[PDB]
Enzyme design. Structure first.
Site, PDB file in Angstrom:
ATOM      1  CD  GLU A  62      -2.916  -0.392   2.647  1.00  0.00           C
ATOM      2  OE1 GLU A  62      -2.448  -0.986   3.655  1.00  0.00           O
ATOM      3  OE2 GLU A  62      -3.944   0.309   2.696  1.00  0.00           O
ATOM      4  CD  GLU A  99       2.719   7.050   0.943  1.00  0.00           C
ATOM      5  OE1 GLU A  99       2.782   5.828   1.210  1.00  0.00           O
ATOM      6  OE2 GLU A  99       1.736   7.763   1.201  1.00  0.00           O
TER       7      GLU A  99
HETATM    8  C1  LIG Z   1      -0.170   1.178   5.299  1.00  0.00           C
HETATM    9  S1  LIG Z   1       0.687   2.567   4.608  1.00  0.00           S
HETATM   10  C2  LIG Z   1       2.295   1.906   4.268  1.00  0.00           C
HETATM   11  C3  LIG Z   1       2.894   1.144   5.453  1.00  0.00           C
HETATM   12  O1  LIG Z   1       4.169   0.628   5.088  1.00  0.00           O
HETATM   13  C4  LIG Z   1       5.104   0.784   6.148  1.00  0.00           C
HETATM   14  N1  LIG Z   1       6.413   0.879   5.507  1.00  0.00           N
HETATM   15  C5  LIG Z   1       6.799   1.825   4.655  1.00  0.00           C
HETATM   16  N2  LIG Z   1       8.049   1.603   4.214  1.00  0.00           N
HETATM   17  C6  LIG Z   1       8.468   0.480   4.782  1.00  0.00           C
HETATM   18  C7  LIG Z   1       9.705  -0.311   4.733  1.00  0.00           C
HETATM   19  N3  LIG Z   1      10.737   0.073   3.963  1.00  0.00           N
HETATM   20  N4  LIG Z   1       9.746  -1.431   5.471  1.00  0.00           N
HETATM   21  C8  LIG Z   1       8.702  -1.818   6.252  1.00  0.00           C
HETATM   22  N5  LIG Z   1       7.544  -1.134   6.349  1.00  0.00           N
HETATM   23  C9  LIG Z   1       7.379   0.000   5.634  1.00  0.00           C
HETATM   24  C10 LIG Z   1       4.656   2.040   6.850  1.00  0.00           C
HETATM   25  O2  LIG Z   1       5.087   2.100   8.220  1.00  0.00           O
HETATM   26  C11 LIG Z   1       3.136   2.017   6.677  1.00  0.00           C
HETATM   27  O3  LIG Z   1       2.451   1.476   7.822  1.00  0.00           O
END
Ligand SMILES: CSC[C@H]1O[C@@H](n2cnc3c(N)ncnc32)[C@H](O)[C@@H]1O
Lengths: 310, 625
Positions: B423, B432
């Protein structure tokens, strides 16, 4: 205090008109204070003006009075801030003034009124930029015209033709009108464009000539035929609000301006008489029917001044 | 309900006048602060020494009424730009005087007119008044859709009305406003009260006012037709505008004498409220984004930042998105597990960035839907959310799900994965840093492995909104570059604005990325055909992604996934607004740039004119790795 006659007169005297019989018609507004309105007054003794008590007849109008004109000897036509044109008919005993009709046809303040040669028809000018033609008999608008691109300053009827009148607006346009023509308006002016047209006066005898005043205190004598401005002098240090010809065979022009000053001028527009009498805006001027050497002025100084002219 | 007001240039008794309009149902009164005909002299004796009072007392009304019920009006005689010196001098002093009195009364707004092309000195005088104390009182500029000279009847013989084609000329009224506003340095206090006439212009000319700050619309009594029953009514096309204007949520002002004399002035107002309630109702989206219109927010960064509980709550509040995800995985499983292999074959499904597990439940529902067997790892770096996952896992998911509290870039996976689900997308898709996150975890996907989502693509479109331009301008903060606001994107429900051209794709990304050398750095050149005269204030951003095959998500208005409020659009502002003329192409250049530490966008306009390159080196804005 005649019956209905108000105790006091609004300070701002906008109109001063002499009947054939020598009576004085005054229109006044309230341009400041709690109540913004206007009244109509008759002074069968002109010299008793502006004393409300020593008046022949008096009435209060819903709103202010931007311009005024005599209809015959008994009717008063009223240009109101209401955007309404009203007809006020005199009493038979001429002791009271009563509204014949009040019609809210104009969308903004009604700035100017003239009466056509018939006296059965009249022309209104407004800040709504419209000019309307009226049946005073039928109490209705025959024709409405949107010729101008700015608020209409002054409208003045041809002396002897019921289909012809002048109009001037902040659109720098003076319009000659003939309802007879399918395109009733014709833009008429001096060689070069110039300062805005403020004041219009047809010649008594010479039905094809008129004078216009500008906001630069210059009065200009115009011949329709030649379509070019014959004569112009700078009479006033301010806007020329009003232009009034004498009843004289060879008429005199009375010049009133926001310079709080009056000038009287010959044919060649040269300056015989000037009057610093007023300490505020000079609003109107009427020549006595009885004594043609007498000229009466009104101001926003609530001063009614009678001038003896050489 | 419609907020509606009465404009009058005649008020004899303010007490009775205000009473009437209340009884007639008007929320406010536009009226003169000095008598419209009461000209004043300031320089030349004797009229300068005119005895007062100069106008009616503030005591005549409650301050509350002054603050709420009264909109002031400049006297029509006051003409600051006159060619005559003495008139300009008196008009200057009169304008100040009248303007100062409105302030004295605490009026909520004051009407000024743009009835000509040269209101230079008028702008200059107001500007001073604005820079004389700091007050919130609005200034409404009365500007007609159609100039009065182009509305006049063709009734002058010698001066006939020009019927020749006049594209730019028919838009002269906007340039009046544009110039005035520009001279006044785009002050928030100066807005538009658009005046409507009987003859509407071309959608074209109406189209000029899309992004403009229109606080009010003025409808003359004149433009109202008469229904059979003598009722005031309006043209269908006059009505299309009113509906348009209602979406912009403007106040309506009725001017002129009541020509429908049988029925009261509630007759006119009745019509408006009639049309108001008779508008088509708000969809979920319209309802969802009810407070958020042209409301700027910074984009979320769920990588460098740990999202709050309520942030995820609203992520989860969009059911359509997760129904889409369930379907993609549902479809993918069936494509990878034959019915003969159903019970012998169990797929390894890894949710990367699981938040509070809405994608885990979707993955689970998808498997029960596909009657196939699945193993789940929920990988999540936000340890606050990892709490939520473990409570879910223990209480509900059971040992079927293995929660992993790690960054997907770092995590050494026990076994490689059949499918990876994510997501990690924002309003500009890649903002993001989904590319970098998924690129890091890519190694623990099987050679035949699937990535949901498989692909995403950013789109950009040029826009005109003087409203939003000024909103960004006002976002200046001490102890940073004074223009940093302009060099950063904002997520916003764009509302008072104009799309100058069709959205074109910007950046695209595919997962997995097979490239021998993988570079997520991008330079894109874009060319936008513009068919209207306009002023570019920035570029609107949208995205589309492919979850699996036909299953997609879009905030692109043309292909917008319907009822899905999970993303508002993004906005790339520009420092200096750029005039664009009909036929001209807008050329924009977008760069996605990277460090070890950070990713950012740099952007420039090259045509019709060059701009500064915005966010050079991520000076003003960066995204954390
Ligand atoms: C549900 S929105 C995207 C989710 O991914 C998680 N996230 C984003 N990037 C990473 C990463 N590199 N490793 C693990 N979790 C991630 C974020 O903490 C968020 O809860």
């Amino acid at each position: 205090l005649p019956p209905n006659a108000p105790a006091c007169m609004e300070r701002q005297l906008e109109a001063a008109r002499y009947r054939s019989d020598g009576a004085l018609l005054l229109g006044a507004s309230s341009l400041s204070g709690r109540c913004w309105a206007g009244s109509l007054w008759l002074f069968k003794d002109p010299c008793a003006a502006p004393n409300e008590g020593f008046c022949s007849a008096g009435v209060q109008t819903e709103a202010g009075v931007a311009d005024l004109t005599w209809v015959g000897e008994r009717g008063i036509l009223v240009a109101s801030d209401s955007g309404a044109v009203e007809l006020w008919e005199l009493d038979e005993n001429e002791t009271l003034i009563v509204s014949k009709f009040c019609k809210y046809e104009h969308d903004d303040i009604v700035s100017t009124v003239s009466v056509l040669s018939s006296g059965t028809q009249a022309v209104s000018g407004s800040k709504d930029i419209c000019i309307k033609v009226w049946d005073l008999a039928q109490q209705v608008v025959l024709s409405s015209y949107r010729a101008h691109a700015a608020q209409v300053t002054c409208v003045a009827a041809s002396p002897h033709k019921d289909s012809v009148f002048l109009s001037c607006s902040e659109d720098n346009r003076i319009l000659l009108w003939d309802t007879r023509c399918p395109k009733p308006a014709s833009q008429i002016g001096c060689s070069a464009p110039g300062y805005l047209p403020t004041s219009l006066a047809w010649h008594p005898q010479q039905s094809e000539v008129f004078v216009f005043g500008d906001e630069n205190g210059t009065v200009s004598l115009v011949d329709t035929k030649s379509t070019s401005c014959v004569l112009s002098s700078a009479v006033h240090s301010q806007c020329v609000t009003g232009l009034v010809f004498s009843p004289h065979s060879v008429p005199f022009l009375a010049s009133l301006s926001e310079d709080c000053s009056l000038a009287v001028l010959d044919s060649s527009l040269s300056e015989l008489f000037r009057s610093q009498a007023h300490r505020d805006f000079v609003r109107d001027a009427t020549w006595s029917p009885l004594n043609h050497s007498l000229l009466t002025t009104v101001g926003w100084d609530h001063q009614v001044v009678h001038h003896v002219v050489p | 309900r419609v907020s509606s007001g009465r404009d009058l240039n005649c008020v004899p008794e303010i007490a009775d006048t205000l009473g009437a309009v209340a009884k007639q149902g008007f929320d406010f009164l536009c009226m003169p602060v000095f008598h419209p005909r009461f000209k004043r002299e300031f320089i030349q004796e004797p009229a300068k020494n005119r005895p007062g009072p100069q106008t009616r007392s503030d005591l005549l009304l409650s301050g509350r009424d002054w603050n709420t019920l009264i909109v002031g009006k400049l006297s029509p005689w006051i003409r600051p730009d006159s060619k005559v010196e003495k008139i300009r001098r008196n008009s200057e002093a009169a304008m100040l005087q009248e303007l100062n009195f409105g302030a004295y009364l605490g009026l909520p707004a004051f009407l000024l007119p743009l009835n000509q092309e040269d209101n230079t000195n008028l702008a200059r005088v107001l500007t001073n008044h604005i820079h004389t104390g700091h007050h919130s009182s609005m200034f409404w500029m009365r500007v007609p859709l159609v100039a009065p000279e182009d509305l006049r009847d063709d009734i002058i013989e010698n001066a006939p009305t020009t019927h020749t084609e006049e594209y730019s000329g028919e838009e002269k009224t906007w340039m009046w406003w544009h110039n005035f506003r520009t001279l006044c340095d785009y002050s928030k206090r100066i807005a538009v009260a658009l005046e409507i006439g009987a003859d509407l212009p071309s959608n074209h000319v109406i189209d000029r006012w899309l992004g403009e700050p229109i606080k009010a619309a003025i409808l003359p009594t004149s433009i109202f037709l008469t229904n059979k029953k003598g009722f005031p009514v309006l043209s269908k096309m006059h009505q299309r505008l009113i509906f348009r204007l209602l979406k912009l949520e403007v106040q309506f002002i009725i001017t002129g004498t009541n020509h429908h004399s049988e029925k009261e002035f509630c007759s006119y107002l009745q019509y408006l409220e009639y049309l108001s309630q008779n508008r088509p109702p708000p969809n979920a989206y319209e309802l969802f984004a009810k407070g958020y219109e042209d409301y700027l927010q910074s984009p979320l960064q769920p990588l460098m930042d740990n999202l709050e509980s309520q942030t995820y709550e609203v992520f989860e509040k969009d059911p359509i998105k997760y129904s889409q995800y369930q379907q993609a995985i549902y479809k993918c499983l069936l494509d990878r597990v034959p019915e003969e292999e159903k019970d012998t074959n169990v797929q390894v499904l890894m949710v990367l960035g699981a938040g509070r597990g809405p994608l885990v439940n979707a993955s689970l529902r998808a498997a029960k839907q596909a009657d196939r067997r699945i193993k789940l790892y929920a990988v999540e770096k936000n340890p606050n959310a990892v709490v939520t996952l473990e409570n879910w896992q223990f209480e509900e998911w059971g040992s079927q799900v293995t929660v992993v509290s790690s960054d997907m870039r770092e995590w050494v996976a026990p076994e490689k994965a059949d499918i990876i689900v994510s997501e990690l997308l924002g309003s500009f898709a890649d903002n993001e840093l989904s590319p970098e996150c998924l690129d890091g975890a890519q190694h623990f996907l099987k050679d035949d492995g699937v990535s949901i989502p498989g692909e995403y693509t950013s789109f950009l479109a040029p826009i005109s909104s003087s409203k939003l331009y000024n909103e960004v301008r006002a976002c200046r903060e001490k102890d940073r570059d004074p223009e940093a606001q302009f060099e950063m994107p904002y997520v916003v429900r764009l509302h008072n604005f104009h799309q100058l051209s069709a959205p074109q794709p910007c950046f695209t990304f595919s997962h997995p990325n097979r490239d021998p050398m993988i570079d997520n750095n991008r330079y894109c050149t874009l060319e936008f055909p513009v068919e209207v005269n306009t002023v570019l204030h920035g570029f609107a951003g949208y995205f589309e992604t492919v979850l699996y095959q036909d299953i997609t998500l879009s905030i692109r208005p043309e292909t917008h996934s319907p009822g899905m409020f999970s993303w508002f659009p993004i906005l790339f502002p520009i420092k200096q607004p750029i005039t664009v003329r009909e036929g001209q192409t807008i050329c924009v250049r977008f760069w996605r740039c990277s460090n070890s530490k950070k990713v950012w966008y740099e952007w420039a306009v090259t045509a019709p004119v060059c701009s500064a390159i915005h966010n050079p080196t991520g000076r003003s804005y960066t995204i954390g790795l």
